[PDB]
């Protein structure tokens, strides 16, 4: 039943994404899992900071960083534009099932449920939620998550778009430079209606 | 049709859920319609033209905004009047209006007022939703100060019933929590944060 | 594999539920999906405004409205009683699979888990959540959701019940009389225990 | 299909867990359902009070109580050490299926995503959420849930850990001595990457 999962795999050895635009190389680990549940897709996403620039964000009061994933008509990840520079694959133990993928489209968000370039239905393309950052003092700091599905496609080859924007705006940063160790968020689980296989 | 009464009276509770049967217009097919509504805004009542039962709509009623509604109705001509009074629910927390509370006690005095604490509640005046129930959060464990609720002004009167020793330099400073006498409505319960308001006690050095 | 879904479809052509009893006809689209996951059922629900009377609710500080689904002993929706007037069915692409339904009883709340007319277990029939509304200014506006399961049967033909009550109470309405376009709620996903097939 | 569920059952006749250390016997019923969903496990947990000392927790303004589940290398519930004193099992109707289990290992938290004895990845072992306690006057008091996965093993035989702590710190006590009937927490659902079968 491994064919029904599409994930980046359990914690990879090296950084696998470029979220912050200031970083020149892979700066953190984006763990994203997609599981088919009948007529929906359950997404299970979070981040693990790697680069010092990304980890330092916790020492700031007003942050907002976005991971953008794009997919073509076959559901394959467009690495050249998507932040997650490593393609998604099926489950094989705790790793990616190195091999060809055919039903990637089945995991992609439905365009009928979530239309492209239609103002009247815009509000159908937004999901919201909350994740938590565990502080070094054993306290949970909220972090807003805004998910945009499709809506806007930059180019011709983009057929599906998933933008996950993490944000937080407080009066006291979760950590201080001496206590900030790594920016890790609790897994965020959301659902969306999936495109036909 | 002939109405059975020129003035109908019904009541519904504040924050009533949608499609709560408010009341029933009686007359004796009979087709009803709402001729007019005062203050006409928002549309919080619905008249079933077939049965004549006035319900609440999805627009939740709000008493502190509108005390009562006056409907002019017709039946199928004659016009009837209806008064719908909104019944208050304890859906507004009291906020202590007075800020700098520094009481001045006189040494070795009994049955004397220490100070006054003004309170504000947006709930209906005179009802249990409006009166303030005071509890001593701290500073009166020794049983010196007694607090009562002046319902006339909804004010917490703090008085003293024990002789005090100024030379003892008794730190009589205290702090209280404020809550309405009736339990809060489910809307704001679990949102109630009992932040204590302190009050300082000053002792006169009687010679 | 499509039998594991019972949903209203994706963006139906016309309104499919009369959520406001004051409305002379169907006024909003209730997009609801039920998916079997082993011992649980995942429900995925949201609302799209159609009629002006429902669309105007965005302008009011305090609002509450309930969608009620009553199902008979064989799991079929009693349209003449429920807010949503179209019988559910399985997935077929992004539409409903027109056909007879016999396994609907598996998508209903379990009678042993959510009892009828039993005060001692009354509290077990409550679920809660938070939807979001996308304001015209690109800001999220929470809406509290209370989902009651069974717990009362209006008439003898009601074997199962799901009541979804949306509501908000705040000091400023999310919109104003000029900016309101439509009332679309962000998806809500909840779970419950399912009865034997 | 029934092999994909691991639950305590629905409303077991007698109390089956001991949360409060002060209790000399089982003090409540812990309803837990773990369901395989691709590369994840969907956990669905709540508690129903039984003993008076447990139900009286509804009268305190600040409460907290923890359920600790420890599993050996094969996933069998260690009854002698855990808080749930009835071994988990598969689904048979609305009850546990009496019989041996061999695929329990698949349900436990993955030892990779949630490693033992590692401070650097510590933050990745915590999930956070919120449930609701429904009051006798029909309120909804939020209960903060903190879940920790296998990030510490107290004994040698422990191979998987799941610690779920409920807590609240509110303004007014949910119930009074006379109105207090039982402590039933609204269902809490969370997700965790599962260990390889």
Author numbering:
A (entry chain A), C (entry chain B), D (entry chain C): 129 to 325
B (entry chain D): 108 to 135, 146 to 193, 204 to 334
From the publication, what sentences describe this entry?
Among human species B adenovirus, HAdV-11, has the particular feature of exploiting two primary receptors, desmoglein 2 (DSG2) and CD46, to mediate cell attachment. Interactions between HAdV-11 and CD46 are well-characterized and clearly depend on the fiber protein, but the mechanism whereby HAdV-11 engages DSG2 has been still unresolved. In this study, we elucidate the molecular basis for HAdV-11 recognition of DSG2 by resolving the structure of extracellular domains of DSG2 in complex with the HAdV-11 fiber knob protein. The structure shows that DSG2 and CD46 engage different HAdV-11 residues and interfaces without overlapping.
During the image analysis, two main populations of particles consisting of the HAd11K in complex with either one or two rDSG2 modules were identified and two 3D reconstructions were obtained at 3.5 and 3.2 Å resolution for HAd11K in complex with one or two rDSG2, respectively. The binding of rDSG2 to HAd11K is very similar in both populations meaning that the binding of a second rDSG2 is possible without interfering with the first rDSG2. The tips of two loops in EC2 (around residue A125 and residues S175, T177, respectively) are in close contact with residues located on the apex of the HAd11K (in particular residues N190 and N192). Several putative hydrogen bonds are predicted in this region which likely contributes to the binding. Regarding the interaction of the EC3 module of rDSG2 with HAd11K, the loop region centered around R316 of EC3 fits snugly in an apical region of HAd11K defined by two loops centered around D265 and D300, respectively. Several hydrogen bonds and salt bridges are also predicted in this area. As reported for the other two serotypes, −3 and −7, the structure shows that EC2 and EC3 ectodomains bind at the top of the trimeric knob and that D265 mediates central contacts with DSG2 (19, 21). Interestingly, the critical D265 residue interacting with the EC3 domain of DSG2 is also seen in HAd11K confirming the importance of this pocket for all DSG2-interacting serotypes. We, therefore, produced a D265A mutant of HAd11K and subjected to BLI experiments, clearly indicated that D265 is, indeed, a key residue for stabilizing the complex with DSG2.
